[PDB]
Design an enzyme around this catalytic site. Structure first.
Site, PDB file in Angstrom:
ATOM      1  N   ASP A   1     -12.055  -3.717   7.987  1.00 28.67           N
ATOM      2  CA  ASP A   1     -11.748  -2.306   7.847  1.00 28.67           C
ATOM      3  C   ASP A   1     -12.183  -1.721   6.516  1.00 28.67           C
ATOM      4  OD1 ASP A   1      -9.627  -3.131   6.125  1.00 28.67           O
ATOM      5  OD2 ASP A   1      -8.117  -2.753   7.684  1.00 28.67           O
TER       6      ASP A   1
ATOM      7  N   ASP B   1       0.846  -1.189   0.000  1.00 24.33           N
ATOM      8  CA  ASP B   1       0.000   0.000   0.000  1.00 24.33           C
ATOM      9  C   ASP B   1       0.889   1.249   0.000  1.00 24.33           C
ATOM     10  OD1 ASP B   1      -1.597  -2.249   0.827  1.00 24.33           O
ATOM     11  OD2 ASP B   1      -2.532  -1.157   2.499  1.00 24.33           O
TER      12      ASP B   1
HETATM   13  C1  LIG Z   1      -1.064  -6.812   3.267  1.00 18.57           C
HETATM   14  C2  LIG Z   1      -2.421  -6.125   3.432  1.00 18.57           C
HETATM   15  O1  LIG Z   1      -3.468  -6.783   3.481  1.00 18.57           O
HETATM   16  N1  LIG Z   1      -2.335  -4.788   3.498  1.00 18.57           N
HETATM   17  C3  LIG Z   1      -3.471  -3.878   3.774  1.00 18.57           C
HETATM   18  C4  LIG Z   1      -4.634  -3.934   2.728  1.00 18.57           C
HETATM   19  N2  LIG Z   1      -4.654  -3.138   1.641  1.00 18.57           N
HETATM   20  O2  LIG Z   1      -5.781  -3.235   0.828  1.00 18.57           O
HETATM   21  C5  LIG Z   1      -5.843  -2.349  -0.217  1.00 18.57           C
HETATM   22  O3  LIG Z   1      -4.950  -1.514  -0.423  1.00 18.57           O
HETATM   23  N3  LIG Z   1      -6.944  -2.442  -0.981  1.00 18.57           N
HETATM   24  C6  LIG Z   1      -7.166  -1.716  -2.082  1.00 18.57           C
HETATM   25  C7  LIG Z   1      -6.483  -0.518  -2.333  1.00 18.57           C
HETATM   26  C8  LIG Z   1      -6.715   0.185  -3.511  1.00 18.57           C
HETATM   27  C9  LIG Z   1      -7.644  -0.317  -4.434  1.00 18.57           C
HETATM   28  C10 LIG Z   1      -8.333  -1.516  -4.182  1.00 18.57           C
HETATM   29  C11 LIG Z   1      -8.078  -2.221  -3.009  1.00 18.57           C
HETATM   30  O4  LIG Z   1      -5.769  -4.696   2.926  1.00 18.57           O
HETATM   31  C12 LIG Z   1      -6.152  -5.055   4.291  1.00 18.57           C
HETATM   32  C13 LIG Z   1      -7.664  -5.178   4.476  1.00 18.57           C
HETATM   33  O5  LIG Z   1      -8.338  -4.069   3.919  1.00 18.57           O
HETATM   34  C14 LIG Z   1      -5.534  -4.059   5.282  1.00 18.57           C
HETATM   35  O6  LIG Z   1      -6.012  -4.346   6.582  1.00 18.57           O
HETATM   36  C15 LIG Z   1      -3.994  -4.130   5.220  1.00 18.57           C
HETATM   37  O7  LIG Z   1      -3.408  -3.218   6.174  1.00 18.57           O
END
Ligand SMILES: CC(=O)N[C@H]1/C(=N/OC(=O)Nc2ccccc2)O[C@H](CO)[C@@H](O)[C@@H]1O
Length: 580
Positions: A332, A231
């Site tokens: 979340d 991220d």
């Molecule tokens: C390794 C991981 O799962 N990183 C994060 C994570 N990151 O998700 C995204 O960045 N999702 C996303 C971002 C941009 C567009 C579409 C999905 O997903 C988890 C559950 O939402 C978070 O809790 C985490 O901190």
């Protein structure tokens, strides 16, 4: 027994605890194992690790796996013998579950985990767990033979940017120490993660600030470390440079201290779907990264279950067994939902293909213990993993005084509803057959089965009893505080269901109109809660029983109102989700 032992032979005889016993190995065995034994309680009890004097007689019985143990109970002696100090602790965790009523069964057990690293990553966005919550979690991992805790809450400024560079303030520091000392005592690896990717400069200065931060966490007693690159944006994404940094960390730090256990990382590409078809990223990491360094992986997507095809695909590229970061029961991205359903979807034959298996939990620490207990069970012995049985066992563990009631509530709070990550779970499966065997009949003028109606009215009656018993329970107060806005909404949902069914068995128009008006008001009450409780900025509110029960109640309301509007030719509004 949770998790289920690899091998268990049970005799029919039971034995009493000894009032008068001989402890052999007390001064040799893991003190955290011996202090549990002395908590739990002549006749010989022999306790120790392979190599200890006290268990020499048994070294052939102790399994040759790290964290393994042999446990024996019979007429003449009790054997608690681990392959290592952690395995003696685990022998005692198993031993405390055998002992019920001052009585033990005659048994023999050979045990060890199928997955090396097993536990929880606190890695969600949202309110970090309170300190008292974390203490509670750590003892809980202990009890369930989880040996990993990756502390890495996205919203901690000292873990993520901008202040990953800065040491913790004195108070936060002293709390992190206590946690470390509690993890130690409970045989858990406190793993401190850092998340510097978004603003890091690939220069000597930032790479040294990162080491000086690690060094400071070491002084507070941390012995495992992680570096998160998920991220993030920009130059922080180059895999050559991540590898060179982690290798630097490994060689100048982990390989220089006498006692560093885990060194873990999270790739910028952390799920198949997020890996660049046309690019070099994950095979660069698998090539360039020191063999001792773990690489984290979420599955084929951010949210996803671990299959054999999926685990093989990542393993081929990183040239080692993926370290699983499983985004369940994390919520979340659905903060108006509680996910209290069973843990399933993960292949049970792939233990060899993973270095570790960790669960990202909900910001609700205790509500999370249902999945955490289940993940503990899955990762220790996946071959014996029983979804539904472990789920019920989890509930009985968290809330024995009201287990039946939590199960009811949890059955109907499992699905995510539609969401940004397209991931769903079963819900209200027990009552589903009756639900559709009612609504398909009702819709087209066909008379319903008595047993379907009654199961539904049963369902609604039980939801109410459950909700009211749960609100007033003082055995697990923190759990009750977490779930209370959903316990309220869940109850209004049941009440609305009862009133809709009364409209169906609808006596006389005035009676019909009374129920009609009560329904519209119960719905207004749910909007009230949905608009006043849990008002986060992402998904504000409180949704419950959304997959099956609410749509049954909604679809049935629309239908009976419709039939009234033909029988008496009326005005009655047929919707429920009208909006304020
Ligand atoms: C390794 C991981 O799962 N990183 C994060 C994570 N990151 O998700 C995204 O960045 N999702 C996303 C971002 C941009 C567009 C579409 C999905 O997903 C988890 C559950 O939402 C978070 O809790 C985490 O901190």
């Amino acid at each position: 027994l949770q998790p289920p032992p690899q091998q268990l032979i049970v005799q029919n005889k039971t034995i009493d605890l000894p009032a008068v016993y001989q402890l052999n190995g007390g001064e040799e065995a893991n003190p955290h194992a011996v202090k549990v034994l002395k908590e739990l309680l002549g006749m010989l009890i022999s306790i120790g690790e392979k190599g200890d004097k006290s268990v020499r007689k048994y070294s052939r019985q102790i399994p040759d796996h790290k964290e393994g143990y042999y446990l024996s109970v019979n007429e003449k002696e009790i054997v608690l013998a681990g392959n290592d100090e952690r395995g003696t602790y685990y022998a005692l965790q198993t031993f405390a579950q055998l002992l019920k009523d001052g009585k033990l069964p005659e048994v023999e057990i050979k045990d060890y985990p199928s997955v090396r690293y097993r536990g929880v990553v606190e890695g969600f966005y949202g309110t970090p767990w309170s300190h008292q919550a974390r203490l509670s979690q750590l003892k809980f991992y202990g009890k369930n033979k989880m040996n990993t805790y990756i502390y890495g809450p996205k919203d901690d400024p000292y873990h993520s940017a901008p202040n990953w560079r800065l040491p913790y303030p004195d108070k936060e520091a002293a709390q992190l120490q206590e946690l470390v000392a509690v993890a130690n005592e409970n045989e858990v690896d406190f793993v401190w993660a850092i998340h510097p990717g978004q603003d890091i400069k690939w220069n000597k200065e930032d790479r040294d600030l990162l080491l000086a931060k690690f060094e400071k966490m070491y002084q507070l007693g941390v012995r495992s470390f992680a570096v998160f690159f998920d991220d993030i944006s920009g130059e922080g994404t180059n895999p050559q440079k991540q590898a060179e940094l982690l290798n630097y960390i490994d060689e100048k730090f982990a390989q220089v201290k006498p006692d560093i256990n885990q060194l873990v990382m999270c790739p910028t590409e952390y799920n198949k779907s997020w890996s660049n078809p046309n690019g070099n990223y994950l095979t660069t990491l698998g090539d360039k990264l020191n063999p001792s360094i773990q690489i984290m992986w979420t599955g084929d997507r951010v949210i996803s279950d671990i299959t054999r095809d999926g685990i093989s695909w990542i393993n081929e590229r990183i040239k080692r067994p993926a370290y699983i970061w499983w985004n369940f029961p994390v919520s979340d991205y659905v903060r108006d939902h509680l996910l209290l359903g069973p843990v399933y979807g993960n292949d049970t034959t792939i233990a060899k293909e993973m270095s570790g298996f960790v669960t990202n939990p909900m910001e609700h620490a205790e509500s999370s213990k249902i999945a955490i207990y289940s993940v503990a069970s899955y990762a220790w012995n996946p071959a014996k993993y029983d979804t539904w049985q472990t789920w019920k066992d989890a509930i009985r563990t968290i809330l024995p005084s009201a287990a039946e009631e939590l199960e009811c509530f949890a059955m109907h709070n499992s699905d995510l509803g539609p969401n940004g990550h397209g991931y769903r779970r079963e819900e209200s499966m027990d009552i589903q057959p009756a639900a559709e065997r009612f609504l398909k009949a009702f819709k087209e003028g066909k008379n319903y089965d008595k047993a379907d109606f009654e199961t539904l009215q049963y369902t609604f009656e039980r939801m109410k009893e459950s909700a009211d018993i749960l609100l007033m329970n003082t055995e697990n107060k923190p759990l009750i505080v977490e779930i209370t806005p959903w316990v309220h909404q869940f109850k209004l949902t049941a009440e609305m269901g009862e009133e809709v069914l009364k409209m169906v068995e609808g006596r006389n128009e005035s009676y019909f109109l009374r129920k009609y008006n009560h329904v519209k008001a119960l719905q207004q009450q749910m909007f009230y809660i949905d608009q006043t409780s849990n008002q986060n900025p992402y998904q504000p509110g409180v949704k419950t029983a959304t997959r099956v029960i609410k749509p049954l109640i909604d679809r049935t309301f629309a239908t009976v109102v419709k039939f009234f509007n033909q029988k008496f030719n009326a005005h009655l509004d047929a919707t429920t989700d009208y909006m304020p």
